[PDB]
Amino acid sequence: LPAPSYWKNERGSELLIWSANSGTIQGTFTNHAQGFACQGIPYPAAGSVSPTGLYFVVTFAQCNSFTRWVGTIKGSQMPTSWTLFYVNKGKPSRLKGGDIFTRVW
């Protein structure tokens, strides 16, 4: 994982990587989905990078949710799958999906 570096997915979410030394990732993630109560606020991204790939987790604190991405780095692209855990009648739920982050700088 190059660091620092900056990546965006197809939905326009941002991933800023500060460092990834000794395979611990220190990053900042911001969602930009209009309507999501935690969009536009930067949250820490934490995880691990290895020869096998990477994973990172972001907790959107004010929204009682977190997402974990797991994937790999292939040059300027970072394909990943994700699992979101959240709470609308106050009921927790899970969602699953995929993202490709592309390196911007």
Residues flagged as binding site for biotin:
9, 31, 37, 65, 99
DSSP per residue over 54-99, as a string? EEEEEEEGGGTEEEEEEE--BTTEEEEEEEEEE---S--EEEEEEE
CATH code for position 47: 2.40.128.30
Rounded CA separation 68/96 (Å): 10
- Which residues constitute the domain of residue 23? 1-105
Q: From the CB of residue 53, how many other CB atoms can be counted at a distance below 10 Å? A: 15
Resolution to one decimal, Å = 1.7
Q: Give me the number of domains the chain comprises.
A: 1
Residues flagged as binding site:
9, 31, 37, 65, 99
| CA separation, residue 61 to residues 13, 30, 77, 91, 94 (Å) | 16, 12, 28, 17, 16
68: tokens are: 């974990």
Type of residue found at 70: V
Facing residues of 86 across strands? 93
| Structural biology method used | X-ray
Rounded CA separation 24/105 (Å): 20
Q: What is the residue whose two structure tokens read 């797991």?
A: 70
Facing residues of 2 across strands? none
Type of residue found at 100: I
